[PDB]
Design a protein around this ligand. Structure first.
Ligand SMILES: Cc1cc2cc(O)ccc2c(Oc2ccc(O)cc2)c1-c1cccc(O)c1
Ligand SMILES: Cc1cc2cc(O)ccc2c(Oc2ccc(O)cc2)c1-c1cccc(O)c1
Lengths: 236, 240
């Protein structure tokens, strides 16, 4: 049960859940390379989400909805995390490290680039830890769709569960900071600082979607995710 | 310097800073037919903007920033601030958005403007969420000031720039402390305090989202040569 895990068991489950770092397939279509990278990461994000404690307790519908809302925020927070020790650069993959003026190739990409670097600098200033990072990523998964669901009794029960798991991750975040020797005030301050960054990740994702949907296939992402989440039980 | 206020002094100063509740400019003898909602909401929003500027200048730490940084923070945050206000004053009216005391709308009347009902539904749910959390006015004013200080903080490398960011974050830390204090006085346990802080701050990300979609919806309508930065500066000259 996801709600009976301790803070240490929670951190431990999220670390264990971490997806692998994938590699990119001169400047070809840089958008080609990045889209191919994202598509391959999506698969591993599905496996990952299924290991976030609480997630597989939800309906298939709500699982898809959550990933459809959060997929870019999740990709972005991973990017920001990887790029943390590389100032002025975004490590999309170990073999695809781009700087600002490489961004000025796709129109509109520069604005998003600058925002991503700034978040990465912020994580670096705060010395964000891996254990904290995985907590934030899981919050993104669980939080980003919750407000834009139906309100059936089933749907109400689903929303209550999500808020219990989010409360457990908060618990876990606080436990980490205490385990790291911060004061209670410092803990509350750091918790606030990190959750406010989630607002900026949401903002970037929204601008990202605008940018991506400005470039005009017959395979909608919803359908894509459903197909991937809706696994059979034949391969035991 | 704002860094030396207590929680109650911070709480009290924000309460003191609260803007008034404006009304919709209404010919109430006139039919509702010959009256576009968007016009009413635009005129309401413009008049609120003036008061928002007055409020912002009384948020502790705000006037310590440069004029350039004050304008930028308001530039990024103004619609979120309008939204959180609408959500707060809509709490006691389930399924309805109190834009002004003489302008209460439901989802149906939202449907009259093309891409509006998406945003109404989102705003309604935010209002429902605040109602189920029993959000206090003391907490509300803290959240509203966090939006002001946080929303443009990443979109500003001069020595002054770093110092300015640094200052904004010290004040945010101060308002965080104030929120925890208020939850302590309400009788919440330490666990319950940090959970509630989290829950409240996670709602800020949904308010940002709604703000982003509101902006898409507004620019799908009107296409300003005069940038918003210039207008926010000019307003400070027009009415101050
Ligand atoms: C911001 C961002 C982060 C990414 C992180 C990844 O781990 C992988 C790809 C990323 C990525 O490119 C994508 C390209 C196509 C697509 O369907 C999904 C992502 C972007 C990105 C790049 C340029 C423009 C844009 O709006 C968004
Ligand atoms: C969401 C919202 C909240 C408002 C809160 C207020 O206190 C006053 C007006 C509001 C308001 O209408 C506006 C109209 C013009 C404009 O320049 C700013 C706001 C909206 C709103 C409504 C429908 C579409 C949209 O994009 C935005």
């Amino acid at each position: 049960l996801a709600l009976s895990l301790t803070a240490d068991q929670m951190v431990s489950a999220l670390l264990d859940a971490e997806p692998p770092i994938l590699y990119s397939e001169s400047e070809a279509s840089m958008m080609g390379l990045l889209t191919n990278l994202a598509d391959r990461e999506l698969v591993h994000m599905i496996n990952w989400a299924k290991r976030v404690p609480g997630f597989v307790d939800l309906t298939l519908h709500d699982q898809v909805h959550l990933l459809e809302c959060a997929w870019l925020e999740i990709l972005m927070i991973g990017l920001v995390w990887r790029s943390m020790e590389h100032p002025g650069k975004l490590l999309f993959a170990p073999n695809l490290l781009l700087d600002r003026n490489q961004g000025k190739c796709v129109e509109g990409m520069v604005e998003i680039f600058d925002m991503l670097l700034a978040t990465s600098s912020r994580f670096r200033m705060m010395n964000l830890q891996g254990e904290e990072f995985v907590c934030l990523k899981s919050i993104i998964l669980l939080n980003s769709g919750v407000y834009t669901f139906s309100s059936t009794l089933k749907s109400l029960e689903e929303k209550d569960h999500i808020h219990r798991v989010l409360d457990k991750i908060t618990d876990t975040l606080i436990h980490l900071m205490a385990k790291a020797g911060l004061t209670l005030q410092q803990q509350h301050q750091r918790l606030a600082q990190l959750l406010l960054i989630l607002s900026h990740i949401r903002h970037m994702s929204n601008k990202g979607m605008e940018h991506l949907y400005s470039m005009k296939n017959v395979v909608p992402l919803y359908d894509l995710l459903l197909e991937m989440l809706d696994a059979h039980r034949l391969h035991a």
